[PDB]
Design a protein around this ligand. Structure first.
Ligand SMILES: [Mg+2]
Ligand SMILES: [Mg+2]
Lengths: 442, 442
C-alpha cells in the first residue's frame, strides 16, 4: 500500500541531507572477519540492490551518498528483513543505525499499517488520540535519541511513515502535540516513554519492531528495570510476537546472556571481536599526575587547533563544570555537556560543538555513546573510565566512517585497574604500547 | 619611588582604552546643586589640573579621553586625597567609579607601599605569598566587581600598582595564581573574599583604603553580616585608621545612619537629591495586564530595533529563563543573565550583549546596579521592582554619561505599592505622567 512515494520538497531535501563525509579507509571495512551464530541465518548481501528495498528506501539512500553497504549492514539488513530477532556487535562508527533503520522502514512500507491500525482511521477521541507506534527504538541518552530520530526523518522521506521522539528535559506538551499529528516509529529514552504511557498518550499494543541501541548499556543495573517496565510489565507483544533487535559496539558475556530474556531464536552478529576498536584511531596513553592534568591538557589544545573539533571526557558533572570554567577563562572557545545542565543548554552546547562555534566540548559520559559528529579529530580522556568498554565507546567518537582520529588518555595511580585490559586492547589495535604500562600489569 | 611611571606598550593601549564617548548633555551636569556636610570639608576642584595627580594619573586620564571632571568627581577627588571618610551620592552614570579610583591610586603612587610593605622584601615561605592589599573595593555582584577591576587596570597603567579581582562562580585556582603575581588593589565580592581569607591567601592587615560601591546594597540585611565579617570580625584596620568611602546613587536614611558604624568624621556628598535620575532618560509607564506583557514586549522589541541594545528586567530567575526561551523560539537574538546560570554562561551572556551579538538581555536584578554598557538605549521593566530604588538603578543602565535613553515600564495591580514614589520621581524628572497613575496614587 505504502511503497508508493509522495511529492518531494527541495526545502526538506536541503534541510535533511548534509552531503556525507566518507573516510579514506572506508574500504578497509571489508578486511574484517564476520561471524554469524544461529539457526538458518540468511545470506549476507554485498549491495543494496541484492534485496527488495522500496522505491522510497533506495531513493533516500542515494540521497545520503551511501555507495555500498558496510559489513554490519550487509549482514543485518537481511536478518531484519527475514523478521528474525538479532543481537549485533560491530565497531564504533561502522553504520549500525542505518543497519537497523533501513530494513524496518522497508518492511513497514510493504506490510503497511496492518489491520490493527487500519481499524482506527474511522474515529478517535479529540486530543485523547493515543498513538500506537509500530516500531520503538530506545537509546540511553537524550541527544542520542534525537540523533536517531533525525536519521529516521532522513530515511522516511517521501513516505507515509512519520517518526517522533520523546525524551526528558524537553517540554512535555510540545512532544504530546507532535505525537497527536501521528506516530508510527517512536524513538525514546525510558523515563519519558513511561511518563507518556502512564498519561495514556502512547500504547505499545501494536509495537512489532523493538530496537535496543547501545544494548549492553540499556541492560545495566540502572536501566534493566526500566527496560522491563516498558517491555515485560506493559502491553508490548512478547518475544516471538514482536521482533527484538539489539545493537552495540560492546557486549560483555553476562549481559549477552541477560539479553536472552528478550530474544527468541536469534542470530548473533559479530563484525569483529566483540569490544574491538577501529584501526583508524591512533591511541596514545600518557602518564599524568592529577595536579598536572590541566597544564597538560592546555598543551594538547594549543597544538590540535587547526580546524578540528576536540572532545574532552571527565568523570563527574562537577568536573566538567570546573574544567569548562577553567578553559573558558584561559581564552578557549568551549562548552560543556553534563547532567546538571538544563536540556536547552545541553542541546545548544552540542549544536555549537557540532557547528565549530565552540570546537572544545567538555563532557561526562552523556557523550560517550552513540553520537557521531563530523570532523571530531581528537578525543582526550582527561579522566580515564573504570572499565574498558566505556573507554572503547569514548574513543569511538572520533575516527568514524573510515576517517582517522587521535585519542590521548591520562593515566596514573587511580587507573591501575584498567591496565591489563587497556594493554590488551592496544595490542590487537596495533598501537604503541607504553613500557611502564606493561611493567605495571606485572 | 612609585610616583614615577614605567615603560609603555601600545599593545596594552589597544587592549585597555576603548575611546570614550560622552553624551550630548554632558554639560547639564554643571546645573546640579551639590551639598557637602561635615567638619572641615576640603574645596571642590573644577579641573584635573587643580590638584597633584602623578604623571601616571594625568596620562591615563587623557588616554581614556576624559576632558574635565564630573560634579561628584570635582567634589570627591579632594576629600579622598585629604584622607577623610566619605559618603557620596550621585546620579547613575555620573562617574562615581573614577571618582574613587583616581585619588586612591594617586595616593598610593606618591606614598608608595609604605615602610610596612617595604619591610617584606627580605624573606618568604614557599608558596605562602599571601598578598596584603593596600586597597579593597567591595561590590554586590560578580560582573560589577570585574567591571571595576577593568577600570582599575585602565587607571593603573604604567605603574607598579597591580590590581586583582576575586568573585564566586569562577575558577578558584586561576584567581589564586593571579593573586600570587601581586595584589595592591583588590576588587571583590564578599563570599569569595572570605573564602580566600580563610584559605590564607589574602590579608587585610595593611588595607588602608576601603571602598563600598553600591553602598546601600552592601548594607542591606543580606550583606551587612558579610560586610561585618570582612571589616569588623577580621584583621582590617578600624575606623579612624583606615579610610572608608561609600558610593551609591541611592541612600535611604536608615541605611545612611547604619553606615555610620563604619565611618569616622566623614563628609556627606549629595550631587543631587538622594535617589534622583538623569534628565537624559525618557521614562514611560504603561498599564499592562499580565497575560499581555509578552505580546506588548514583542511590539516594543520590533520598534526600537535599529542598532541599539535592549535590557529587559524580570522579577524571578525562573521568569528570566522563561522569557529568554520565549524570545528565542520567536526568532530574536537574545540571552539571559541571572543567578541560576553558570558563571561561565553568565559572563558569556554579558559579553555577547555588550558586543551586539545578542542585543536583547533578559535579566534579574543582577544587572540592576553598576554595569555601564555602551549603546544600551532602551530599558524595559517587564516586571516592576517592589521599591523605587531598584527602579532608579534599573533605568540607570541607559542614559549614562549624558547620552539619552528610553525606559518603558509595565504596570498593573501588583505594582500598586510603588505608585506614589514612582509618581513623585516622574514629576521631579520632568517626565510625562500617566493620568491613571495620579488617580491610582491617591
Ligand atoms: Mg550508534
Ligand atoms: Mg557605579
Amino acid at each position: 500500500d505504502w511503497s508508493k512515494p509522495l511529492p518531494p520538497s527541495e526545502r526538506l531535501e536541503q534541510e535533511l541531507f548534509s552531503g556525507g563525509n566518507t573516510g579514506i579507509n572506508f574500504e578497509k571495512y571489508d578486511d574484517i572477519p564476520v561471524e554469524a551464530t544461529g539457526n538458518n541465518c540468511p545470506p549476507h548481501i554485498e549491495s543494496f540492490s541484492d534485496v527488495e528495498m522500496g522505491e522510497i528506501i533506495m531513493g533516500n539512500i542515494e540521497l545520503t551518498r551511501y555507495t555500498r553497504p558496510t559489513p554490519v549492514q550487509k549482514h543485518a539488513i537481511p536478518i531484519i528483513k527475514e523478521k528474525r530477532d538479532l543481537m549485533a556487535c560491530a565497531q564504533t562508527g561502522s553504520g549500525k543505525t542505518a543497519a537497523f533503520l533501513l530494513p524496518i522502514l522497508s518492511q513497514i512500507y510493504s506490510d503497511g499499517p496492518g489491520e490493527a491500525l487500519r481499524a482506527m482511521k474511522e474515529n478517535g477521541r479529540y486530543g485523547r488520540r493515543k498513538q500506537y507506534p509500530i516500531s520503538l527504538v530506545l537509546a540511553p541518552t537524550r541527544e542520542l535519541a534525537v540523533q536517531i530520530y533525525e536519521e529516521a526523518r532522513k530515511f522516511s522521506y517521501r513516505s507515509r511513515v512519520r517518526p517522533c521522539v520523546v525524551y526528558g528535559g524537553a517540554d512535555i506538551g510540545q512532544q504530546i502535540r507532535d505525537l497527536e499529528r501521528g506516530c508510527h516509529l517512536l524513538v525514546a529514552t525510558p523515563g519519558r516513554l513511561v511518563d507518556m504511557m502512564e498519561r495514556g498518550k502512547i500504547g505499545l499494543d501494536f509495537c512489532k519492531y523493538l530496537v535496543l541501541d547501545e544494548a549492553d548499556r540499556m541492560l545495566d543495573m540502572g536501566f534493566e528495570p526500566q527496560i522491563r517496565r516498558i517491555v515485560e510489565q506493559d502491553t508490548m507483544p512478547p518475544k516471538g510476537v514482536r521482533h527484538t533487535m539489539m545493537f552495540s559496539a560492546t557486549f560483555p558475556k553476562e549481559i549477552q546472556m541477560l539479553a536472552r530474556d528478550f530474544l527468541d531464536e536469534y542470530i548473533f552478529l559479530a563484525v569483529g571481536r566483540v569490544g574491538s576498536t577501529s584501526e583508524n584511531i591512533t591511541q596514545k596513553v600518557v602518564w599524568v599526575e592529577e595536579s598536572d592534568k590541566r597544564s597538560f591538557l592546555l598543551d594538547l589544545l594549543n597544538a590540535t587547533g587547526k580546524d578540528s573539533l576536540t572532545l574532552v571526557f571527565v568523570e563527574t558533572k562537577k568536573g566538567a563544570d570546573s574544567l569548562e570554567d577553567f578553559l573558558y577563562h584561559e581564552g578557549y572557545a568551549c562548552t560543556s555537556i553534563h547532567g546538571d545542565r538544563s536540556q536547552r543548554d545541553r542541546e545548544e552546547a552540542l549544536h555549537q560543538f557540532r557547528s565549530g562555534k565552540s570546537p572544545i566540548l567538555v563532557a561526562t559520559a552523556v557523550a560517550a555513546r552513540g553520537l557521531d559528529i563530523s570532523n571530531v579529530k581528537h578525543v582526550i580522556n582527561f579522566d580515564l573510565p573504570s572499565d574498558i568498554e566505556e573507554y572503547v565507546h569514548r574513543i569511538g567518537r572520533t575516527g568514524r566512517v573510515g576517517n582517522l582520529g587521535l585519542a590521548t588518555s591520562f593515566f596514573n595511580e587511580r587507573n591501575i585497574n584498567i591496565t591489563k585490559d587497556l594493554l590488551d586492547l592496544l595490542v590487537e589495535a596495533k598501537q604503541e604500547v607504553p613500557s611502564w604500562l606493561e611493567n605495571m600489569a606485572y
